């Protein structure tokens, strides 16, 4: 899987209250954050089935 799928999740500054997925690797599974609106990293995925696939091989 790509490293990046290892961080955190990041919201960013901005204020909007949006469920993004990322990929919790100590769980071995994608999970919801709440994404901010701006400055997404990597690990931030509209698509739970995009996070799955891209992260959890």
């Given at each position: 899987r790509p490293d990046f799928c290892l961080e955190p999740p990041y919201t960013?500054?901005?204020k909007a209250?949006?469920?993004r997925y990322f990929?919790?690797?100590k769980a071995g599974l994608?999970?919801?954050f709440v994404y901010g609106?701006?400055?997404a990293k990597r690990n931030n995925?509209?698509?739970a089935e995009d996070?799955?696939?891209t992260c959890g091989g």
């Open positions: 960013g500054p901005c209250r949006i469920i990929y919790n690797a994608c999970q919801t609106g701006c400055r995925f509209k698509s996070c799955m696939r």
